[PDB]
Amino acid sequence: GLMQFTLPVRLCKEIELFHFDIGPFENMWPGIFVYMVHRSCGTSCFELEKLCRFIMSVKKNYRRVPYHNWKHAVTVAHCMYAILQNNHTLFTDLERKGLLIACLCHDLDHRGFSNSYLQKFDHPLAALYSTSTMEQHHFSQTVSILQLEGHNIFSTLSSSEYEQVLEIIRKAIIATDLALYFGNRKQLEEMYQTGSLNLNNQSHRDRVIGLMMTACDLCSVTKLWPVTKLTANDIYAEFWAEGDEMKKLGIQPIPMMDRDKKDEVPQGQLGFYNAVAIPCYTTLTQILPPTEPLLKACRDNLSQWEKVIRGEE
Numbered sequence: 001g002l003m004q005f006t007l008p009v010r011l012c013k014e015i016e017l018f019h020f021d022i023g024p025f026e027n028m029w030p031g032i033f034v035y036m037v038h039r040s041c042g043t044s045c046f047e048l049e050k051l052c053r054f055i056m057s058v059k060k061n062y063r064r065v066p067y068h069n070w071k072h073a074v075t076v077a078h079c080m081y082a083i084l085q086n087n088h089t090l091f092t093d094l095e096r097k098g099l100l101i102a103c104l105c106h107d108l109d110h111r112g113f114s115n116s117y118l119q120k121f122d123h124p125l126a127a128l129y130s131t132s133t134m135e136q137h138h139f140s141q142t143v144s145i146l147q148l149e150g151h152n153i154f155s156t157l158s159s160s161e162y163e164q165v166l167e168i169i170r171k172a173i174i175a176t177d178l179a180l181y182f183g184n185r186k187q188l189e190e191m192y193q194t195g196s197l198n199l200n201n202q203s204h205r206d207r208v209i210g211l212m213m214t215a216c217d218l219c220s221v222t223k224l225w226p227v228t229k230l231t232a233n234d235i236y237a238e239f240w241a242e243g244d245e246m247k248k249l250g251i252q253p254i255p256m257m258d259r260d261k262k263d264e265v266p267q268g269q270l271g272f273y274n275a276v277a278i279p280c281y282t283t284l285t286q287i288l289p290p291t292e293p294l295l296k297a298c299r300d301n302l303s304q305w306e307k308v309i310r311g312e313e
């Protein structure tokens with residue numbers, strides 16, 4: 001009970017900031033997650049023996065891919081932690097429990113290929129889950145691990161609290177399907193502007209959690225430019241591999257996934273910032289004003305890509 005996780009001074013201070021990088025020491029990441037769980041949720045939230053066994057099972061079920069790896073799981077969980085800590089009173093106990101676990105589990109068993117590639121390959125998962133293919137698989141993987149003997153971190157919740165938390169996690173993971181983000185933000189924009197947004201409405205909370213999940217999932221665009229730029233190599237490493245696999249199926253991939261078209265990436269990032277990233281962090285700042293540093297970091301990084309295209313770097 002009295003066993004608190006403590007980080008070195010520099011991490012203890014920087015972990016509270018949105019632009020925190022979790023560092024290259026893999027063996028510190030579980031402790032960084034437990035630290036955030038204890039401060040975000042409480043030391044009572046989870047049995048430490050069960051939590052530690054859950055964390056290491058999740059880690060085992062993330063693959064050795066360039067981007068959709070264990071580091072991403074923890075990095076996304078950290079963004080959620082920063083949003084929850086800056087929005088203390090807005091979220092219930094069950095939501096702070098569920099969401100940190102949802103983020104850690106949101107890309108479980110990712111092979112580094114899009115829902116689109118699974119469909120064109122005719123992968124079994126595409127037959128099992130017609131839409132949001134990988135995300136339904138991520139939730140499936142999350143339930144499987146929870147049901148491993150001595151892994152059920154929610155055991156002390158009631159039947160209805162258990163069913164509520166797993167429903168928060170399912171919606172949260174399904175919302176990381178970027179295909180579902182465009183309509184979710186648009187609805188949230190209308191609701192905010194017409195002033196019909198109501199956080200006591202469960203359907204409206206769901207949409208706001210959805211947007212929070214997109215913002216956490218994209219948080220690599222909200223880091224210091226050195227972090228954002230080097231993470232962008234890992235992301236394009238996966239895109240170009242999928243491009244290669246499309247060519248193998250006899251399909252020219254989109255320029256974004258074509259390694260023969262690397263020159264187009266700077267402009268491709270501009271579109272992504274303008275079409276997805278900036279809108280996402282703007283709506284989020286409108287609903288949750290203390291999340292404004294994500295929008296500011298994201299705009300700084302937009303400018304850095306503009307500087308790449310102008311040949312200044």
Ligand SMILES: CC(C)(C)c1ncc(Nc2cncnc2)c(C(=O)Nc2cccc(OC(F)(F)F)c2)n1
Nearest residue numbers: 178220221228231232235256268269271272275276
């Ligand atoms: C896996 C998924 C959630 C979809 C994702 N995550 C991070 C991304 N960028 C990133 C940037 N810097 C560092 N780390 C990650 C991109 C991306 O660049 N997506 C992208 C890039 C170009 C065009 C495009 O089309 C779209 F705008 F319609 F989404 C999408 N996509």
Ligand SMILES: [Mg+2]
Nearest residue numbers: 106107176177
């Ligand atoms: Mg995903």
Ligand SMILES: [Zn+2]
Nearest residue numbers: 072106107217
């Ligand atoms: Zn992700």
